[PDB]
Amino acid sequence: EFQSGSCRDKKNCKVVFSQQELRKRLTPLQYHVTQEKGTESAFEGEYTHHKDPGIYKCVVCGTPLFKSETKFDSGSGWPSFHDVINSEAITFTDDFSYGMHRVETSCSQCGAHLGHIFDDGPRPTGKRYCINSAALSFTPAD
Ligand SMILES: [Zn+2]
């Protein structure tokens, strides 16, 4: 009666890298977050206080995820966006850890763990995509 598994669990990701390639190409924190559903510490991420115009992509596979124009300061300690470039890029699953309910967000293309989505976001969506800095790469606007 709930949603579970990324495309890695289902062994049907469109993009698959070997763990060996990812160990070299990602920092230990980026690897832990995206590959082991880790969470960076509050305010650990470069992109938390970062307001330059551009596009944030999945740090693993490069799929575009978030526009700078939806980024906002949630005071939470992690990057926060009120919308996604398009929802087909995200796998939403139910997270029941710690005796609470949250919706985890993962990349639908490679399965990377990104973060969570909450209902305390600003207008116009009311959504907060709460995303690890270490799950993202940033491409500055032209
Ligand atoms: Zn990805």
Numbering used by the authors: -3 to 138
What text appears in the publication on this structure?
Human MsrB3, lacking the signal peptide and carboxy-terminal KAEL sequence, was produced in Escherichia coli as a fusion with maltose binding protein (MBP). After cleavage and purification, MsrB3 was treated with dimethylamine-borane complex to methylate lysines as described, since attempts to crystallize the unmethylated protein were unsuccessful. The treated protein was crystallized by using the hanging drop vapor diffusion method, and crystals diffracting to 1.87 Å resolution were obtained. Though the amino-terminal segment containing the CX5C cysteines did not exist in the search model, phase information from molecular replacement was sufficient to allow building of the remaining ordered regions. The MsrB3 structure could be built through residue 137 (numbered according to the mature protein sequence as in Fig. 1), but residues 138–156 were initially not visible in the electron density. On further inspection of electron density maps from the full-length protein crystals, a segment corresponding to residues 150–156, most likely arising from molecule B in the asymmetric unit, was detected, making interactions with symmetry-related versions of both the A and the B molecules. In addition, electron density corresponding to a sulfenic acid was seen for the active-site cysteine in this crystal form, with the hydroxyl group oriented toward a conserved pocket rich with hydrogen bond donors and acceptors. In particular, the side chain hydroxyls of Ser72 and Ser76 as well as a guanidinium nitrogen of Arg124 are all within about 3 Å of the hydroxyl of the sulfenic acid. Though no substrate was added during the preparation of MsrB3 for crystallization, the sulfenic acid modification may have occurred as a byproduct of formaldehyde addition during the methylation reaction. The fortuitous modification of the active-site cysteine may help shed light on the mechanism for stabilizing the sulfenic acid intermediate and preventing it from engaging in unwanted reactions before it can be cleared by reduced resolving cysteines.
